[PDB]
Amino acid sequence: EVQLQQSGAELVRPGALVKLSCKASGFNIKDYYMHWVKQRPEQGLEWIGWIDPENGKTIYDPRFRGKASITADTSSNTAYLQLSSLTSEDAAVYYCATSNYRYDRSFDYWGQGTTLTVSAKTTPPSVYPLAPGCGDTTGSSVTSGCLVKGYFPEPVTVTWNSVHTFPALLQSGLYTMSSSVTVPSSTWPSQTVTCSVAHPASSTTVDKKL
Amino acid sequence: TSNRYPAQPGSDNRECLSMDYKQTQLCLIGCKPPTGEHWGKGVAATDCPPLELFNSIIEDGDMVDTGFGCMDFGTLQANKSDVPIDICNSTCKYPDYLKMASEPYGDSLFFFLRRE
Amino acid sequence: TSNRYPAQPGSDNRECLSMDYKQTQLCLIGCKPPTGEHWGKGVASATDCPPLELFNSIIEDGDMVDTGFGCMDFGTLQANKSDVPIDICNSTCKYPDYLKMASEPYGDSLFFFLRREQMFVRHFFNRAGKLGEAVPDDLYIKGSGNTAVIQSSAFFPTPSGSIVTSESQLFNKPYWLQRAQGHNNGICWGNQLFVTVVDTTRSTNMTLCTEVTKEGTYKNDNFKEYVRHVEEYDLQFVFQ
Amino acid sequence: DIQMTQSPSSLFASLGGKVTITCKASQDINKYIAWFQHKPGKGPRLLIHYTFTLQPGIPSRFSGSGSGRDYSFSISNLEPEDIATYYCLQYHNLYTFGGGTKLEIKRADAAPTVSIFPPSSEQLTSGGASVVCFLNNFYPKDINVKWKIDGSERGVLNSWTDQDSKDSTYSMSSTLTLTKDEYERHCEATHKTSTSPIVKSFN
């Protein structure tokens, strides 16, 4: 079972240094190539570089030669991606991937991803319940909601108890995420429906009963 | 030591390598130029080129065998990439000691030393 | 073994490396200072490769012997000061011109001499920088893609000199100058004598370490490292 | 050095249909092209290497072809789990990805299930007020939500989900932010599904 665990949600103020991790399990890092790929929001994939951990070979795209010091330690079976002098453009999603010279299939396996955001503030969220008023039903269905407002940065996990969780929108230096559950009138208000909101960057675990 | 599966080269997997050749000392003295031997392209279930053993006069500047044999690398190795560049387009010759010793008058080998 | 494509060099890819030199023992005895040979930058005349000239010179006490990179003037023929280690990179390595000293008429240079040199290739490397003389097109088929840019074929080997033993020692044993091969049979004209010695079999470099700050735990910045080398001689002569 | 021109940038077809993506390279890459499938929140999944060699486990409905500078990649018998963004990639000289192609599954009939939610008493305690209108399960993704506080005041915030793999529908939430909201407030949804905007409200 080949896996590529990867660091997640690293926020650094502009402009300092950042080093992302990616250690594999199920194969030796010394054997295969370790690649790095970038993806800016609403943009495509840009190959950053590759490293041969057996001898520290470095291969970069001439764009990234300036601020991309990639390394790898075979003892820890880990690959590192260091970026210096972060900018607003530098914030993106980063992936590590495995390549093979003796069997040249491009990018065998990819990591789950690392999200890098660049700002100068961190704030916890707030949870507001969303329940109707007088309420129609005629015995069929009732929709309940959960509004997470004002937090930074991503991500925020919202678990219920077919639910739709909308992508978070940013404005005025804050975020806003919603989630809507649909359950029949036999469950509400008979069965309690608790919206569980979690924010890792602030150690927030807020449960909200409707 | 380690060459596991799977594995299949691409279209160009050549590498930039170097090596030290076989050590050879020798000296031949005579009133006739020495006669050397080398393998060349001669004249069918295989497409392997036919091999023929050629005799020739060893001239000043000819390449000696380096551990890859005494052969015409220019004609028998068409890719020009199986041996280093100083012999890849040259012919390596080895002294035909048996022929030069078996000639009737013995004008080729008055005396010789060799250490390979 | 492995130096696959592609290759993306930098502007400074020098490394901090070391090696052990070619092993050389020799002793020359005569009434005339020895004559050594070394290659230097001559004058002549095309390519920008520097012209080579074979120079003869008197071997003085302290001159560097050949180390496996040849007998040449590294100060003038290697301008980057980084192709050979620092103890010869700005010095001249000299090799005894045995042929000239043997062919001189009176034979005053070499009453007698012994020599034992040995070395082998330990590692294989290549040089960084612009390849001055490109490989001609008739020696290879051009590549493409990753192999589009050819790598530097400016190879250089590292010497070693294998092993030292007491059984191979040339010194600490008497030499009897009974009959010299030259015309001078050991006559010390001018009431002087010249003994040239090279002995790499006692090249141990002692490491010295001083404590700048004493602490309960080890810290690298608390110590200074020095390197020293010693040589001990005891010349004994019997004259007639 | 080598550029990858991927066309088109988006696709749409019904379930069971066939789509095709084309990538033209700036120079010959000697058939060394790969095709990837990238879903949001996941890592890219290698579908094809060396122009027309499928990876183990990839269904045969995915296919590729081409040579020199021109290559193509087809997906027959489209299925709901195919909703992703596909990329081509040359690996003849270093690496260069294509622009990408956002694939969507074509359905119909989907009309938004609009539900309105007043600001909770807790947000009114904090000092704000956010009225939220949920538009669930509609198609296509293009929809217009117009907030009108009588008669039509019009700080809206819109957020669209991706196309769900279960049902090929979209969903969006509209949040109107106000403070000291003392005038009684109540949104309309203009969509291709109806002749008039579907309006949910409260007093």
mmCIF file of N, CA, C and O in Angstrom, chain C residues 119-151:
data_model
loop_
_atom_site.group_PDB
_atom_site.id
_atom_site.type_symbol
_atom_site.label_atom_id
_atom_site.label_comp_id
_atom_site.label_asym_id
_atom_site.label_seq_id
_atom_site.Cartn_x
_atom_site.Cartn_y
_atom_site.Cartn_z
ATOM 1 N N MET C 119 50.130 4.137 -7.525
ATOM 2 C CA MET C 119 48.839 4.799 -7.385
ATOM 3 C C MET C 119 47.807 4.035 -8.201
ATOM 4 O O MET C 119 48.149 3.274 -9.111
ATOM 5 N N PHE C 120 46.540 4.247 -7.857
ATOM 6 C CA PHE C 120 45.423 3.740 -8.638
ATOM 7 C C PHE C 120 44.296 4.760 -8.579
ATOM 8 O O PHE C 120 44.334 5.715 -7.796
ATOM 9 N N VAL C 121 43.281 4.552 -9.409
ATOM 10 C CA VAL C 121 42.151 5.471 -9.498
ATOM 11 C C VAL C 121 41.099 5.059 -8.476
ATOM 12 O O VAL C 121 40.555 3.951 -8.541
ATOM 13 N N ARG C 122 40.810 5.956 -7.534
ATOM 14 C CA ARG C 122 39.835 5.699 -6.482
ATOM 15 C C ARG C 122 38.417 6.071 -6.906
ATOM 16 O O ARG C 122 37.487 5.278 -6.730
ATOM 17 N N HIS C 123 38.234 7.265 -7.470
ATOM 18 C CA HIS C 123 36.917 7.731 -7.881
ATOM 19 C C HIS C 123 37.010 8.425 -9.232
ATOM 20 O O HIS C 123 38.093 8.778 -9.706
ATOM 21 N N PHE C 124 35.846 8.617 -9.848
ATOM 22 C CA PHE C 124 35.727 9.233 -11.164
ATOM 23 C C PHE C 124 34.764 10.404 -11.064
ATOM 24 O O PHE C 124 33.604 10.221 -10.681
ATOM 25 N N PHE C 125 35.237 11.598 -11.412
ATOM 26 C CA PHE C 125 34.424 12.807 -11.386
ATOM 27 C C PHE C 125 34.544 13.525 -12.726
ATOM 28 O O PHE C 125 35.315 13.128 -13.604
ATOM 29 N N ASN C 126 33.769 14.599 -12.875
ATOM 30 C CA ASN C 126 33.844 15.469 -14.038
ATOM 31 C C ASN C 126 33.902 16.921 -13.579
ATOM 32 O O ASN C 126 33.526 17.255 -12.453
ATOM 33 N N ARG C 127 34.379 17.783 -14.471
ATOM 34 C CA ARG C 127 34.580 19.190 -14.157
ATOM 35 C C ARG C 127 33.321 19.998 -14.439
ATOM 36 O O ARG C 127 32.535 19.676 -15.334
ATOM 37 N N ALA C 128 33.137 21.059 -13.659
ATOM 38 C CA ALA C 128 32.103 22.048 -13.911
ATOM 39 C C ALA C 128 32.694 23.222 -14.681
ATOM 40 O O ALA C 128 33.881 23.534 -14.560
ATOM 41 N N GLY C 129 31.855 23.870 -15.474
ATOM 42 C CA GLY C 129 32.274 24.979 -16.307
ATOM 43 C C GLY C 129 32.177 24.647 -17.786
ATOM 44 O O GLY C 129 31.876 23.523 -18.193
ATOM 45 N N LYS C 130 32.444 25.669 -18.597
ATOM 46 C CA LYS C 130 32.339 25.532 -20.044
ATOM 47 C C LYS C 130 33.379 24.551 -20.572
ATOM 48 O O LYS C 130 34.574 24.686 -20.297
ATOM 49 N N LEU C 131 32.916 23.561 -21.331
ATOM 50 C CA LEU C 131 33.815 22.622 -21.993
ATOM 51 C C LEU C 131 34.481 23.328 -23.168
ATOM 52 O O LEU C 131 33.818 23.675 -24.151
ATOM 53 N N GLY C 132 35.796 23.541 -23.070
ATOM 54 C CA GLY C 132 36.479 24.349 -24.068
ATOM 55 C C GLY C 132 36.539 23.693 -25.435
ATOM 56 O O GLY C 132 36.414 24.367 -26.461
ATOM 57 N N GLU C 133 36.732 22.379 -25.471
ATOM 58 C CA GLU C 133 36.815 21.623 -26.718
ATOM 59 C C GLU C 133 35.657 20.631 -26.727
ATOM 60 O O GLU C 133 35.697 19.613 -26.031
ATOM 61 N N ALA C 134 34.631 20.931 -27.519
ATOM 62 C CA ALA C 134 33.444 20.093 -27.557
ATOM 63 C C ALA C 134 33.737 18.768 -28.251
ATOM 64 O O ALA C 134 34.617 18.670 -29.111
ATOM 65 N N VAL C 135 32.992 17.743 -27.860
ATOM 66 C CA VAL C 135 33.145 16.422 -28.478
ATOM 67 C C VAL C 135 32.690 16.500 -29.931
ATOM 68 O O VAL C 135 31.582 16.996 -30.203
ATOM 69 N N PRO C 136 33.494 16.041 -30.890
ATOM 70 C CA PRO C 136 33.083 16.114 -32.296
ATOM 71 C C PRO C 136 31.846 15.272 -32.573
ATOM 72 O O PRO C 136 31.539 14.307 -31.869
ATOM 73 N N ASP C 137 31.129 15.658 -33.631
ATOM 74 C CA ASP C 137 29.831 15.063 -33.927
ATOM 75 C C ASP C 137 29.932 13.625 -34.421
ATOM 76 O O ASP C 137 28.935 12.898 -34.371
ATOM 77 N N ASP C 138 31.101 13.198 -34.896
ATOM 78 C CA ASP C 138 31.242 11.850 -35.431
ATOM 79 C C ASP C 138 31.453 10.802 -34.348
ATOM 80 O O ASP C 138 31.606 9.620 -34.675
ATOM 81 N N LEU C 139 31.464 11.199 -33.076
ATOM 82 C CA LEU C 139 31.702 10.278 -31.974
ATOM 83 C C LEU C 139 30.442 9.955 -31.186
ATOM 84 O O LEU C 139 30.510 9.168 -30.236
ATOM 85 N N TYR C 140 29.299 10.531 -31.552
ATOM 86 C CA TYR C 140 28.063 10.288 -30.823
ATOM 87 C C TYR C 140 26.885 10.730 -31.675
ATOM 88 O O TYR C 140 27.018 11.566 -32.571
ATOM 89 N N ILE C 141 25.726 10.149 -31.381
ATOM 90 C CA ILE C 141 24.466 10.577 -31.974
ATOM 91 C C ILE C 141 23.816 11.571 -31.023
ATOM 92 O O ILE C 141 23.708 11.310 -29.819
ATOM 93 N N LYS C 142 23.395 12.715 -31.557
ATOM 94 C CA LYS C 142 22.814 13.757 -30.722
ATOM 95 C C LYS C 142 21.540 13.263 -30.045
ATOM 96 O O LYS C 142 20.818 12.410 -30.568
ATOM 97 N N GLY C 143 21.272 13.811 -28.861
ATOM 98 C CA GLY C 143 20.110 13.449 -28.083
ATOM 99 C C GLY C 143 18.954 14.413 -28.285
ATOM 100 O O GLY C 143 18.959 15.273 -29.168
ATOM 101 N N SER C 144 17.940 14.256 -27.437
ATOM 102 C CA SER C 144 16.754 15.093 -27.517
ATOM 103 C C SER C 144 16.030 15.060 -26.181
ATOM 104 O O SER C 144 16.188 14.127 -25.389
ATOM 105 N N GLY C 145 15.229 16.096 -25.946
ATOM 106 C CA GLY C 145 14.485 16.220 -24.708
ATOM 107 C C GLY C 145 15.373 16.460 -23.506
ATOM 108 O O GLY C 145 16.081 17.470 -23.439
ATOM 109 N N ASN C 146 15.333 15.539 -22.540
ATOM 110 C CA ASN C 146 16.199 15.653 -21.372
ATOM 111 C C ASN C 146 17.671 15.559 -21.756
ATOM 112 O O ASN C 146 18.517 16.219 -21.141
ATOM 113 N N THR C 147 17.997 14.755 -22.768
ATOM 114 C CA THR C 147 19.370 14.591 -23.221
ATOM 115 C C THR C 147 19.745 15.584 -24.317
ATOM 116 O O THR C 147 20.674 15.320 -25.090
ATOM 117 N N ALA C 148 19.042 16.717 -24.399
ATOM 118 C CA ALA C 148 19.325 17.694 -25.446
ATOM 119 C C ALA C 148 20.625 18.437 -25.169
ATOM 120 O O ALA C 148 21.390 18.729 -26.096
ATOM 121 N N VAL C 149 20.894 18.748 -23.905
ATOM 122 C CA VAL C 149 22.091 19.477 -23.505
ATOM 123 C C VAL C 149 23.121 18.460 -23.034
ATOM 124 O O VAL C 149 22.894 17.739 -22.055
ATOM 125 N N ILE C 150 24.255 18.402 -23.734
ATOM 126 C CA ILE C 150 25.277 17.410 -23.434
ATOM 127 C C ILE C 150 25.967 17.763 -22.122
ATOM 128 O O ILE C 150 26.154 18.944 -21.792
ATOM 129 N N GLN C 151 26.334 16.739 -21.358
ATOM 130 C CA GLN C 151 27.021 16.954 -20.096
ATOM 131 C C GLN C 151 28.519 17.113 -20.328
ATOM 132 O O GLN C 151 29.052 16.774 -21.387
#
